[PDB]
């Protein structure tokens, strides 16, 4: 077809309202603008692979994934994981000055939606650990479906 | 449009290879045949709402959901959760003799795929707790995407 190329942009971003699993892994599929987000306790190579396992289940396997040069994305372990799946990986140009403003915008929209929803439910600070999962799933829903 | 009506079928099914969170909540969206599955430690009203929160995030909100009369689906708590989302709910006819063979077939396909994938990875009995999540996401992927 002449349709979009299946390229994802992935990034992690800190959200203290979701502590203790405050690191949010966010993937924007650039062909559809669909967002996938998962929560993690630490920013490591394995949290990035667990996030991509879930995004693959939800959006299918991409042709390539663009990330920055965080070490969780360029370690040995993460390059071998992406090679086992046959997914090409680029961190773009060095000083590329971000060829990944989609996931950057997605991160701000996501944090804002989480703040609005949680305050609507009366949580002005950290969201109680047991309510976190349904709220994060409600923020993902709101940003993806109309 | 003249397209399918957005109706889901949901059910729980036991999978000891995924112990201790061996209860699998599985939703088949009947318009697309897409499957959503999440893992749980117990079969309760809250595990059913946590599962539907995730399926809503992944497939959008449905118009109705068909389930059997398990108590986790007909309790007060679960009917109020579905009423907060504005999702209609039916358990079909009493002696309906299952107007939900889609999710029933989906359950068998799912368990078979989990067995094949895990044995391909050398796990002939229970899958090690730390490998469970990526394998369940790999089974979901295999049943949804081509």
Curated annotation (Swiss-Prot), chains A, B:
Cofactor(s) of this protein: Mg(2+); Mn(2+)
Record: residues binding Mg(2+) 3: 11, 68, 104
Cofactor info, note text: Binds 8 Mg(2+) ions per integrase homotetramer. Zn(2+) can also be a cofactor for the nicking activity, but not for the polynucleotidyltransferase activity.
Domain Integrase catalytic as annotated: residue spans: 1-146
Record text on subunit structure and interactions: Homodimer; further associates as a homooctamer.
Biological role: Catalyzes viral DNA integration into the host chromosome, by performing a series of DNA cutting and joining reactions. This recombination event is an essential step in the viral replication cycle. Has a strong preference for using the 3'-OH at the viral DNA end as a nucleophile.
Free-text comment about domains: The core domain contains the D-x(n)-D-x(35)-E motif, named for the phylogenetically conserved glutamic acid and aspartic acid residues and the invariant 35 amino acid spacing between the second and third acidic residues. Each acidic residue of the D,D(35)E motif is independently essential for the 3'-processing and strand transfer activities of purified integrase protein.
Name of the protein: Integrase
Native species: Rous sarcoma virus subgroup C (strain Prague) (RSV-Pr-C)
First-to-last residue of the parent protein present: 1334 to 1479 of 1603
